[PDB]
Amino acid sequence: ADVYDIGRGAVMYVAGGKVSWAPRGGNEVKFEPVPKELKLVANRLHTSFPPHHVVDMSKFTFITPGSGVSMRVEYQYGCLPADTVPEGNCWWRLLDSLPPEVQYKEIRHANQFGYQTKHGVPGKYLQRRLQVNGLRAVTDTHGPIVIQYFSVKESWIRHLKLVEEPSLPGFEDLLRIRVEPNTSPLAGKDEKIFRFGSHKWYG
Amino acid sequence: ADVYDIGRGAVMYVAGGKVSWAPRGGNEVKFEPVPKELKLVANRLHTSFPPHHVVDMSKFTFITPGSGVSMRVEYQYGCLPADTVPEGNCWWRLLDSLPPEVQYKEIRHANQFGYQTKHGVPGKYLQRRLQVNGLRAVTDTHGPIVIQYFSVKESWIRHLKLVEEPSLPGFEDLLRIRVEPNTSPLAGKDEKIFRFGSHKWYG
Numbered sequence: 033a034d035v036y037d038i039g040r041g042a043v044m045y046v047a048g049g050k051v052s053w054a055p056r057g058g059n060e061v062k063f064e065p066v067p068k069e070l071k072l073v074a075n076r077l078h079t080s081f082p083p084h085h086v087v088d089m090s091k092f093t094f095i096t097p098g099s100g101v102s103m104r105v106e107y108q109y110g111c112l113p114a115d116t117v118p119e120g121n122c123w124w125r126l127l128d129s130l131p132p133e134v135q136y137k138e139i140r141h142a143n144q145f146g147y148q149t150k151h152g153v154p155g156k157y158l159q160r161r162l163q164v165n166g167l168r169a170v171t172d173t174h175g176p177i178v179i180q181y182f183s184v185k186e187s188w189i190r191h192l193k194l195v196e197e198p199s200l201p202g203f204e205d206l207l208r209i210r211v212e213p214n215t216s217p218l219a220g221k222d223e224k225i226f227r228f229g230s231h232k233w234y235g
Numbered sequence: 236a237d238v239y240d241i242g243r244g245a246v247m248y249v250a251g252g253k254v255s256w257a258p259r260g261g262n263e264v265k266f267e268p269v270p271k272e273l274k275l276v277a278n279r280l281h282t283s284f285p286p287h288h289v290v291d292m293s294k295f296t297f298i299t300p301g302s303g304v305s306m307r308v309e310y311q312y313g314c315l316p317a318d319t320v321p322e323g324n325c326w327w328r329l330l331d332s333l334p335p336e337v338q339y340k341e342i343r344h345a346n347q348f349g350y351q352t353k354h355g356v357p358g359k360y361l362q363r364r365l366q367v368n369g370l371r372a373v374t375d376t377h378g379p380i381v382i383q384y385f386s387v388k389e390s391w392i393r394h395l396k397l398v399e400e401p402s403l404p405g406f407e408d409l410l411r412i413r414v415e416p417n418t419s420p421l422a423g424k425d426e427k428i429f430r431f432g433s434h435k436w437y438g
Contacts, residue, residue: 033289035387043287054257057286060308062434064389083260084246086236105263184238186267231265 036066038074052086053078080110085183091201092116116201118191120152120235125192126211130165151189152235155228168214169226175210190234239269241277255289256281283313288386294404295319319404321394323355323438328395329414333368354392355438358431371417372429378413393437
């Protein structure tokens, strides 16, 4: 490991070609500042990711300051190519089986809540929509659909995509499920209903 | 790596038998909580160390909550055996060559400032005392004295001890010096005057 004060209330840890940032703390927290050979990387990092996630900054591609996109709730403009972060709608796939009007009414709905955000939708909300649409999502060791997190298991930042699409950068397969009509008993008993977690998000 | 919310404004990272904590951030920061198999370790950690330092918590020994000692500036009572953290005076050694009255007048003095604290004394202050006492400290590849940091190079938490004493836990030899009268020219030019850093501390 290694660790530097990088301004504006954060600090940044480094080890591998891997890197993290975190808030400073109080005025007693006072490390060496950043080696300037890395001021770049600071700025990049702090501006575009959230604290406490670890990243290989080679795997990502940066573009000029104030002109890109951020994964930070605060931050409207980042330096990430939007091709490269989720757009916050990846959860629609889940409603694929419904009729069109209905997918769309759902989609409207979430924009009626906050949700048509870059983080997607909560999870409780997801579960609950859906429940009501006669669906049900089941943890299927062989399913079509991958659930993912960004960067560390326990993050609140999730995503899903189909098994055969290509992972976005820093996303990491968590598990596999299937979506089916919640109309008949659960098939077997190995099988289980997927509980979207509380405080998770899917975009 | 791995990462959990552990209450009261922090979170904690884990990897190896090694562990760290850091402040949470804003209300958006929301991870999994601690596996309770580790709530202990949280409490231990957050109560006794400062953020952003990494520790092998096996190497340390804990004692009942509210009855021990903390490395945290905030925290009067910790759970560390005081045998096991610095007492904040390790810098006296540096004034070994002066007469007694004079070591003591210096020592009084630092207690006249804040300094007779568990973190010892700043560095600028150290340099500056000493300077004035006709001493001078020189980076001596072969010196008697070890300079140390706790846990990561760039910490502000330093310590020194003689080469032959045993390291306290989590301390890590940084470099070696010697103390001499600042009365005659510097011997050679390989050699250099040690600059105690700004924002470093020695206890």
